RNA sequence: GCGGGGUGGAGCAGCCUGGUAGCUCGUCGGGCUCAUAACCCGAAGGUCGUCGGUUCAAAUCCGGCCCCCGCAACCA
RNA sequence: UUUCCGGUGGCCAUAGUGGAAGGGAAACACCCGGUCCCAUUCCGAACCCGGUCGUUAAGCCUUCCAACGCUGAUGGUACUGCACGAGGGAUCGUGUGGGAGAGUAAGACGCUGCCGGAAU
RNA sequence: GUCGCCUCCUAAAGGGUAACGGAGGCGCCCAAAGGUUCCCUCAGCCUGGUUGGUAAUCAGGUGGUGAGUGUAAGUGCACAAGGGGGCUUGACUGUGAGACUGACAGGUCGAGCAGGGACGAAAGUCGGGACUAGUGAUCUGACGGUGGCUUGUGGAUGCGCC
């Protein structure tokens, strides 16, 4: 008959934004999983092995822009 | 019979067939044209059809511009087998045709004659369509 | 030594006073002069021994007065044999003192005894004021021996003028001094 | 310049053998230089071959005939 | 089997603190690094176990 | 469908892998003979079925295609 | 206080690209040297050092030019959540909310903070 | 024909989502292709130039990403994560606030701290590699270290821990 040479794929990784803006976070809290930096890291945020940005600091959520890039900060806490 | 010289992949979902024409609903090169009223999947084969009805009326004079490109493959499941092992192999190559695209265009011949040629064509095609002109 | 070379006062007061007299510049630096020499050589022959390049040095080091940088193929080509990052040719850039005192003993001396010499073509600029010619044979160079070389090779020079147009280049290095011809 | 990694290049005399002497620099080792033809000594430019060609077909003709 | 494991072992306590992989063909004799050794307290050679 | 094969004029090597295409016969030129066959001495001869890709580089690696084979194409 | 200019940020083309004209008081710069720290996978080109003569030609700065690029509505259309409807069928329509892309008018030859400079 | 892992599409703008659906990869590699510090900008195109040709090396002009990235693809990266030089071993030991992701086993990220180092004038960065595949639970056995236990005591032997 006939037969694929396709059907192989690999497991979901669970990728994407888990902290929108405004959101309350933690330290260290992860604020994205991703693969390269569609979103660089901003004031009070660190960036991780694999490109996972995580929060330095308790305080807010927020996505803007740092010159020319994508950046994600977290606004210290009023 | 228009094929394409290569295609990026050679199995393809179905195209999209609603909506309305995207683009080229007018128009472009000659002076009267096909335009279809009914959308559907147009193979070269009768694009072909249509192509050498209408030069074959229109003899020597005037020039057909093609307006649509069978570049859509469409497989073919192998012959008598059952459901299943994998997608079949390109069969038909098809242009994705909405509702006002114009097909063919004339130019360089006189109205009642490229109406008739037009006519000629039309009978070939599997959807509805008309003639039009640039309001003569 | 401490001493400004006869090339290089030559160009300053008798090539600076024509050019300002017969181009008009309206500023004092817009007189072109040499920039700079480079000295190429490829010796894509060198693909599958490493003496012809040792020879390379050598003869440029002999010729120019300095160590030359040695490029490596940005590229591997098979047709003409040669890998990625093998040594394939060696360039001098000379500057200043080294370039004004090489230019002179070059086109003073070298050239002058070419085999049946007939001068340079006028029309071998880049189209920017500067002007690149090869030399088919090397040994040429009486500053290098002549019963030790280990093959002929031959070279690019190249003058980089600060000259904005080719015929302002070619007025600039006619009165340094080339021989040329009215031929192409 | 980089120590060590330049050749000997110091004062150097050259003789034409035309009545040409002059005080460049250049590496010839313990030594000067003995030219055997300077620019303005060289029969190109100094004007001395002129040979253009002999295209004087006819001029032959008459030569060994007129 | 062309890139096999080795084990670093402190020079001076003789300690197989460490293990990771070399290339037998690019790096064929004994390799020597500076690690922290534990039981020496500080950074010491470590070498390769034959 | 599975697996193999396509290289001078013919029949066959070169395919783990890239870089140097070989043997036998035949073709062609010269000897030997009265002449031919045989034999003796020299030479040419295939850019590798085709399209495309990999790669610095493809007879060799990968895919499509064409040709030739073999096998399978079963149970009621 | 103002004007002009040099640094250093922010917005990241409404700022760019290209063309034209003009300017240097301080300053910037090219420029002039290489002795000295230092430097070139060769080269005092660059980096670095020593000068500030020369020069506004260029960088830089000012004015001008929508020319390429960029920005860009309103209205309409596509699509669409929900609720239905029509065709033999591809598919299509309506109600009620949302509503582009493109295109059109147009905008635009940047904006703004701090420090320093020379003058007021 | 397929069975585990990775990338894309299908997948309907979070995540997830099946088929003998559509495309490819993996079972490594690198003592630098790791760490750090400083420096650099490509491909293409045009012109000129010994050998030299479309294309080797050289010069000028142009050119912002179309080159490049050890290896698939995507997301990234010209601020370079791309190219080069110097010095190095953090391809550490003891840890892990706080999270991500799975039915679970499990998989992933991680600030801060101490010890002892590398680099840098410093600020600082370093718990392998631009990122995501390059992998196998438990059992049983083995080697090295340690010396917790040892059936009367001391040894031995055996075991435990790492
Ligand atoms: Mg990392
Ligand atoms: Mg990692
Ligand atoms: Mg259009
Ligand atoms: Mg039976
Ligand atoms: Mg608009
Ligand atoms: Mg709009
Ligand atoms: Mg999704
Ligand atoms: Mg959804
Ligand atoms: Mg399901
Ligand atoms: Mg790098
Ligand atoms: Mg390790
Ligand atoms: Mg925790
Ligand atoms: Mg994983
Ligand atoms: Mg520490
Ligand atoms: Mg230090
Ligand atoms: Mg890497
Ligand atoms: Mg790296
Ligand atoms: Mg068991
Ligand atoms: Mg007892
Ligand atoms: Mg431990
Ligand atoms: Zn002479
Ligand atoms: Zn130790």
Redesign the pocket.
């Given at each position: 008959?006939?037969?694929?040479?396709?059907?192989?794929?690999?497991?979901?990784?669970?990728?994407?934004?888990?902290r929108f803006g405004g959101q309350l976070?933690?330290?260290?809290?992860?604020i994205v999983?991703?693969?390269?930096?569609?979103f660089?890291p901003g004031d009070g945020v660190?960036?991780?092995?694999?490109?996972?940005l995580?929060?330095?600091?308790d305080g807010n959520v927020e996505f803007?822009?740092?010159?020319?890039?994508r950046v994600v900060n977290v606004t210290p806490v009023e | 019979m228009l094929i394409p010289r290569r295609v990026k992949?050679?199995?393809?979902?179905h195209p999209?067939?609603?909506?309305?024409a995207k683009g080229g609903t007018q128009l472009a090169f000659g002076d009267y044209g096909i335009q279809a009223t009914?959308?559907?999947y147009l193979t070269n084969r009768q694009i072909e059809a249509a192509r050498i009805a209408m030069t074959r009326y229109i003899k020597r004079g005037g020039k057909v511009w093609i307006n649509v490109y069978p570049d859509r493959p469409m497989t073919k499941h192998?012959a008598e087998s059952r459901?299943?092992?994998?997608?079949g192999?390109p069969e038909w190559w098809i242009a994705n045709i909405?509702?006002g695209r114009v097909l063919f265009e004339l130019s360089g011949v006189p109205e009642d004659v490229a109406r008739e040629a037009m006519r000629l064509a039309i009978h070939k095609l599997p959807?509805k369509a008309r003639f039009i002109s640039r309001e003569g | 030594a401490?001493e400004m070379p006869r090339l290089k006062k030559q160009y300053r007061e008798q090539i600076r006073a024509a050019m300002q007299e017969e181009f008009g510049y309206?500023?004092?630096?817009?007189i072109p002069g040499l920039?700079?020499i480079?000295v190429?050589?490829?010796?894509?022959?060198?693909?599958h021994d490493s003496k012809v390049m040792d020879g390379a040095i050598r003869d440029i080091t002999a010729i120019?007065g300095?160590?030359?940088?040695?490029?490596?193929?940005?590229?591997?080509?098979?047709?003409?044999?040669?890998?990625?990052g093998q040594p394939?040719?060696?360039?001098?850039?000379?500057?200043?003192?080294?370039?004004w005192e090489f230019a002179d003993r070059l086109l003073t001396l070298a050239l002058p005894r070419i085999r049946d010499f007939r001068g340079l073509?006028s029309?071998?600029?880049?189209?920017?004021?500067?002007?690149?010619?090869?030399?088919?044979?090397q040994v040429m160079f009486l500053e290098i021996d002549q019963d030790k070389i280990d093959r002929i090779?031959?070279?690019?020079?190249?003058f980089?003028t600060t000259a904005q147009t080719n015929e302002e280049g070619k007025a600039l290095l006619k009165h340094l001094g080339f021989p040329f011809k009215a031929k192409d | 310049?980089?120590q060590g990694?330049?050749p000997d290049y110091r004062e150097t005399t050259v003789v034409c053998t035309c009545g040409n002497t002059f005080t460049t620099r250049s590496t010839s080792q313990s030594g000067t230089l003995n030219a055997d033809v300077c620019s303005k000594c060289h029969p190109f430019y100094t004007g001395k071959q002129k040979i253009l060609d002999a295209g004087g077909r006819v001029a032959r003709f008459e030569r060994r005939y007129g | 089997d062309?890139?096999p494991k080795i084990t670093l072992?402190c020079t001076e306590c003789?300690?197989?603190?460490?293990i990771?992989?070399?290339?037998r063909?690019?790096?064929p004799d004994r390799?020597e690094?500076?690690?922290?050794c534990?039981?020496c307290?500080?950074?010491t050679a470590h070498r390769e176990t034959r």
């Open positions: 008959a006939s037969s694929s040479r396709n059907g192989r794929d690999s497991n979901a990784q669970r990728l994407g934004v888990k976070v933690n330290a260290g809290e992860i999983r991703q693969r390269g930096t569609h660089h660190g960036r991780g092995g694999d490109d996972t995580f929060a330095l600091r803007g822009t740092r010159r020319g890039r | 992949y050679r199995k393809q979902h999209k067939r609603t909506g309305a009914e959308g559907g192998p459901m299943g092992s994998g997608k192999t909405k509702p959807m | 401490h309206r500023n004092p630096m817009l920039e700079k480079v190429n050589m490829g010796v894509g022959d060198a693909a120019t300095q160590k030359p940088q040695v490029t490596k193929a940005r590229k591997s080509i098979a047709q003409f044999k040669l890998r990625e394939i040719g060696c360039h001098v850039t000379l500057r200043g003192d080294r370039m073509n029309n071998q600029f880049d189209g920017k004021g500067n002007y690149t010619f090869g030399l088919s044979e090779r031959g070279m690019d020079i190249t980089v | 310049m980089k990694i330049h | 062309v890139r072992a003789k300690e197989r603190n460490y990771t992989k070399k290339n063909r690019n790096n390799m690094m500076a690690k922290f534990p039981r307290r500080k950074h």
